[PDB]
Amino acid sequence: TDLADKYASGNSEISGQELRGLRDAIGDDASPEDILALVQEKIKDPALQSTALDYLVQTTPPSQGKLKEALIQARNTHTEQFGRTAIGAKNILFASQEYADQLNVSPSGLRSLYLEVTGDTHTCDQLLSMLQDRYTYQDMAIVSSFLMKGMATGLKRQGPYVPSAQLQVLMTETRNLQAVLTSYDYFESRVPILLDSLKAEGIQTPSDLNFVKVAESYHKIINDKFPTASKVEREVRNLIGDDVDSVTGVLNLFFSALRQTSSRLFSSADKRQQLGAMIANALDAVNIN
Amino acid sequence: MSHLNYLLEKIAASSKEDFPFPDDLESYLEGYVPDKNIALDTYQKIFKISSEDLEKVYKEGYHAYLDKDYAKSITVFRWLVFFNPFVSKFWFSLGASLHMSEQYSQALHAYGVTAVLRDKDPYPHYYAYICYTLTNEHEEAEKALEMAWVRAQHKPLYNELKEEILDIRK
Ligand code: NA
């Protein structure tokens, strides 16, 4: 219809009514300062503020030449003041809205996270620790995909804020995160099944035992570049105790994980194969021969 | 679109990962000797890839090899070895491609694995001999030559090779 509606049509965080309302509040004789003040007042999120400013500059007719000049200056000052907080967030606006629709998080919450993640160097582990406090594990998969989608967008634009080489490393680390998540996803499902099984035969398991603990042990074992049956057995015993059926159950779970978790988890085919062997060896040592 | 790319996209799509594979298959396969006695499913099995699918990919890599595009063939064969490292012709074609690319150190490894998977064949050992010769010389060439010799003699299938080894030794 009109220009305000076109801006707002695919944008779930603003309406044409709200854009026109901002436009109608700004007089012909408004200064850049006056403009910015009204923008912060009516629009809370910097990305939407930046979007509204684009609209104001574009919709202002020839008769209001002085206003248009003031708006252009005002938008420039806004971009200078907020920087990536405005422009970077705005460039992932629609992505953030589509992904937030699948979560119990706000689109702005996702944009804040993206800015934080890509705003500095981050390893796989640092990304994990970051997500662990903020999200459930099942939500982390979607969140990780949002991060990848945003960074893929950042590679095309080749912006001034975050260098290309950094995005490449960030995407690599995030891919590693997604691989790590497969383990947590796997154990979250299977561990309660093991616990119910052990309970069904009257075997008590440690109260401090959960799928997160098991997943961390799994990764500790995988990240051991020289696996032995002894070390694997000891790790399992520290995890669930000394009951033979309990130890065996975890070992079988670890072995099954080798074909159910991401191939990216293993830096070499040799160690994956060797780890399979050592778990198999640990199972034999544990059971009564 | 190559069938290999079709498979990778098919697998990637059905996962919760953008790219559920190692970034560097060269590094991933280094020093790897597939052990048939380890009770682990191959990734072909895990990803439910049919043997017909892998064969299509093999021809793609083989076609690239015949076009002297060794770089492309090496890429393909590594993926095949990643999916099913117990197929000896995958390693052999990988070795040949590395050989033609003058990447002898890695060519030697691929030939060595081929030998393990295919004990009766003298040819993986013979091409190992050639490569060991090309390093001028690790002195592993003669040991590999003898291994080819043992497997080559007495059998009519490997007579052409038996003649050559005799011709070499003089
Ligand atoms: Na809207």
Residue numbers in the entry:
A (entry chain A): 94 to 382
B (entry chain D): 1 to 170
Give verbatim lines from the article.
This study presents the structure of a molecular complex that physically links one class of early substrates, components of the secretion pore termed translocators, to a gatekeeper protein, a protein that has been implicated in the secretion hierarchy.
The amino terminal 84 residues of CopN were not included in the construct used for crystallization because they are unstructured. CopNΔ84 is structurally similar to other gatekeeper proteins, both MxiC from Shigella and the YopN-TyeA complex from Yersinia. The structure reveals that Scc3 does not engage CopNΔ84 using this conserved binding groove. Instead, the amino terminus, referred to here as a gatekeeper-binding region (GBR), forms a relatively flat surface, adjacent to the convex side of the TPR and binds across the interdomain interface of the last two domains of CopNΔ84. The interface formed by this interaction results from burial of 980 Å2 of surface area. This interaction includes three tyrosines, one of which, Y43 is oriented to allow a π-cation interaction.
